[PDB]
Design a protein around this ligand. Structure first.
Ligand SMILES: CC(=O)N[C@H]1[C@H]([C@H](O)[C@H](O)CO)O[C@@](O)(C(=O)O)C[C@@H]1O
Ligand SMILES: CC(=O)N[C@H]1[C@H]([C@H](O)[C@H](O)CO)OC(C(=O)O)=C[C@@H]1O
Ligand SMILES: [Ca+2]
Ligand SMILES: [Ca+2]
Ligand SMILES: [Ca+2]
Ligand SMILES: [Ca+2]
Length: 753
């Protein structure tokens, strides 16, 4: 909440008394509006008496101030005297800066509870306007810092005992004469509640084109709890502020219009602010109301998907939800030949004396030894697909030494392609077409086998391929038809088992196969619009992107979901590379990255920080509850950053929880990163308490901090830059109540070093 005074000549507000303040003078104390400085200002005349203005607060307001902090900003010039006291007393204590001009005319400041003085200015500067800031940070040992024209003057100012209870400004002394002119006074109590529990999962973004416009989001949880529960009906809600996050409009339910029968739960509002159009595009997941991500309950035949809503900042209008599920929710049969081999063979009776054709729509997730083959009783034709050292898609044909480079652009390397083999009896050769394009012709190898086969063929060569369709034809008749795209979307009432459909499963070692992705979820936090991609091959400026959570069947991982056309068409990137190990040739040990957040670095690389759920130890290596990743291709592929995990964040909580990361750019052009997460209480233990703020001045190599922003409950949070000097934070606190913090970043950074 803000309590302020802005000097103006406008009649309706031409005095502090007309702006909510109470006059509190004694004897000859007085005041008058002055214009001698070009801009109006209120002249406090404390000659022969006290001259001050006060504001009273309630018990609840003082408590909020103590737990979430406060800040006082003053723009004034001292004309003469002393005891110019602008402060806040809460009934038990106060931080009191005493400003005055000494006998030589220098502007100086002293602090109750502190001995000495600090000269702030001399000469003509001593009697000119200046900006004074007092910032109080909560904690077991809370203190305040004083800034003069943006520069840290005094830190760790201890509160002193006092019975006064009020916000005050002016000359607070009946005996000491003091005269000062005020242009503006602002006392802000941090922590206003914007969304109330049991609602949860906050995210927030602000407009750069229209400074002051902020859009916040959360999950409206009627009945409470995570999505997927029969006892709740969850929707996406939002509120907008046009004054920097001080006042907010009516809570708005964005998804009830597409949840008319309460048949769904919506979750994870992931907003992205696009400067090119000055709009906010928020993506969110849909789930049937009785099955979701937790417990892997959601299945491919269920209504999970992703939708988005668009907000026009200029006119302040929201647009109806748009479904993009088909673009980002993969439907296929997946074979993970990681630590083994898994092939499916269907014996056939092809006639090598006549033409035959086969089609296989395949996507290579990773590795090699991924193949599709067809044998017709005379010759065998095998196409082996792999990812080379450069990350390109390569094909090798049996009997041909020279490998064929199919794709070099990472996005196309891991996308689905239609591999079509056309055998010509009269030419005794087979032609390979990829996506309708003729690639090469070869003779294969002599063979007596007659079949069609696909999968990962080598236990010593890791590889994962996803298939959407397989067909073999001859004489205009389909000999084999396997539509995985269709089957993955069917209920258990339909037969989907390859072995029951006529195929033979040939497996060795350890492998896993399954149908389509169980679900896609934008995840908690905000997304970003890239603007430093000029030197990133395959990427582009303007790209909208966020790190989504994808569940294949049992395991969670993260992948980029992005759009290169403003949000109309979306594409998915590759999942994060994580270690895996089979214990005793039977127990799978791997990681499960989930709730993630990303930021674009100065050189265009993308830094991603992700929560690691469930198992966190692989082959004796503990990856902690959080791990950072890096992308050098616009978010298509990632790399796990060695030793860059929860440990780079000193005093971060040891419990798994969502965090937030974002870029902060100052007016001088300099920049750095901001990160928020609970510190735990004590700091460094498991607990969603005391939200902390970390800073990175080296592109995420190291982090400084944390600066404690909250004293008490602190769970999920999201931070975003508000303007050149402030960042806005939304955080879940007591009973998950989401509160707003508006932090003076350019000031706080001075408390580090
Ligand atoms: C900032 C502050 O607390 N000032 C207070 C002063 C000072 O304690 C004395 O002038 C000693 O300098 O005492 C008062 O009775 C006064 O003079 O009006 C009340 C006023 O609020
Ligand atoms: C979409 C969803 O259910 N995510 C939930 C998440 C999830 O269960 C965990 O990340 C394991 O995957 O847990 C929590 C949580 O406060 O810890 C809140 C989220 O609502
Ligand atoms: Ca409803
Ligand atoms: Ca539900
Ligand atoms: Ca987050
Ligand atoms: Ca699971």
């Amino acid at each position: 909440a803000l309590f302020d005074y802005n000097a103006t000549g406008d009649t309706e507000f031409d005095s502090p008394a007309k702006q909510g303040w109470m006059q509190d003078n004694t004897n000859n104390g007085s005041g008058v509006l002055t214009n001698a400085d070009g801009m109006p200002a209120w002249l406090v005349q404390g000659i022969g008496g006290r001259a001050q203005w006060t504001y009273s607060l309630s018990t609840n307001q003082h408590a909020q101030a103590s737990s979430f902090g406060w800040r006082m900003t003053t723009e004034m010039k001292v004309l003469s005297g002393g005891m110019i006291t602008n402060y806040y007393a809460n009934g038990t204590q106060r931080v009191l800066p005493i400003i005055s001009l000494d006998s030589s005319g220098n502007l100086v400041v002293e602090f109750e509870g502190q001995t000495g003085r600090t000269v702030l200015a001399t000469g003509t500067a001593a009697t000119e306007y200046h900006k004074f800031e007092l910032v109080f940070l909560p904690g077991s040992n809370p203190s305040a810092s004083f800034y003069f024209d943006g520069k840290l003057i005094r830190d760790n100012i201890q509160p002193t005992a006092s019975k006064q209870n009020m916000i005050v400004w002016g000359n607070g002394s009946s005996n000491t004469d003091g005269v000062a002119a005020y242009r503006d006074i602002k006392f802000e109590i941090q922590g206003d509640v914007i969304f109330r529990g049991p609602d949860r999962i906050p995210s927030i973004v602000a407009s750069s084109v229209t400074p002051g416009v902020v859009t916040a989001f959360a999950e409206k949880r009627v009945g409470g709890g995570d999505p997927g529960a029969l006892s709740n009906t969850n929707d996406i809600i939002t509120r907008t502020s046009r004054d920097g996050g001080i006042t907010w409009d009516t809570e708005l339910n964005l998804t009830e219009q597409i949840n008319v029968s309460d048949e769904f739960d919506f979750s994870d509002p992931r907003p992205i602010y696009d400067p090119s159009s000055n709009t906010v595009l928020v993506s969110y997941a849909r789930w049937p109301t009785d099955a979701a991500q937790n417990g892997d309950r959601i299945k491919p035949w269920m209504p999970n998907g992703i939708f988005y809503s668009v907000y026009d900042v200029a006119s302040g209008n929201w647009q109806a939800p748009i479904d993009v599920t088909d673009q980002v929710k993969e439907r296929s049969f997946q074979i993970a030949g990681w630590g083994g081999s898994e092939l499916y063979r269907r014996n056939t009776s092809l006639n090598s004396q006549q033409d035959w054709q086969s089609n296989a729509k395949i996507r290579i997730v990773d590795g090699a030894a991924n193949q599709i083959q067809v044998a017709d009783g005379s010759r065998k034709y095998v196409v082996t697909l792999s990812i080379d050292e450069s990350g390109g898609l390569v094909a090798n044909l049996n009997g041909v030494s020279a490998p064929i480079i199919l794709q070099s652009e990472h996005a196309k390397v891991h996308s689905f392609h239609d591999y079509e083999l056309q055998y010509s009896a009269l030419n005794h050769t087979t032609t390979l077409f990829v996506d309708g394009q003729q690639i090469t012709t070869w003779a294969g190898e002599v063979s007596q086998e007659n079949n069609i086969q696909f999968g990962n063929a080598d236990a010593q060569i890791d590889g994962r391929l996803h298939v959407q369709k397989i067909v073999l034809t001859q004489q205009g008749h389909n000999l084999v038809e396997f539509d995985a795209f269709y089957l993955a979307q069917q209920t258990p009432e339909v037969e989907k088992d390859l072995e029951k459909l006529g195929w033979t499963k040939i497996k060795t070692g350890n492998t896993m196969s399954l149908y389509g992705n169980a679900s896609v979820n934008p995840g908690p936090g905000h997304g970003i619009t890239l603007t430093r991609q000029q030197n990133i091959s395959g990427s582009q400026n303007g790209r909208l992107i966020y790190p989504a959570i994808v569940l294949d069947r049992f395991f969670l991982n993260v992948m980029s979901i992005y759009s290169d056309d403003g949000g109309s068409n979306w594409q998915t990137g590759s999942t994060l590379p994580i270690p895996f190990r089979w214990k005793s040739s039977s127990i799978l040990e791997t990681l499960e990255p989930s709730e993630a957040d990303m930021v674009e670095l100065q050189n265009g690389d993308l830094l991603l920080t992700a929560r690691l759920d469930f198992n966190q130890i692989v082959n004796g290596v503990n990856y902690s509850p959080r791990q950072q990743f890096l992308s050098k291709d616009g978010g298509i592929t990632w790399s796990l950053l060695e030793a860059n995990n929860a440990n780079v964040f000193s005093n971060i909580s040891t419990g798994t929880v969502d965090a937030s990361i974002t870029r902060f750019e100052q007016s001088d052009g300099s920049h750095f990163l901001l990160f928020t997460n609970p510190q735990g209480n004590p700091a460094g233990t498991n607990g969603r308490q005391n939200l902390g703020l970390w800073f990175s001045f080296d592109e995420g190599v190291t982090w400084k901090g944390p600066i404690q922003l909250v004293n008490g409950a602190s769970a999920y949070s999201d931070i975003y830059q508000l303007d050149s000097e402030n960042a806005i934070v939304i955080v879940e606190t007591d009973n998950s109540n989401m509160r707003i913090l508006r932090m003076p970043i350019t000031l706080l950074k001075q408390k580090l070093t």
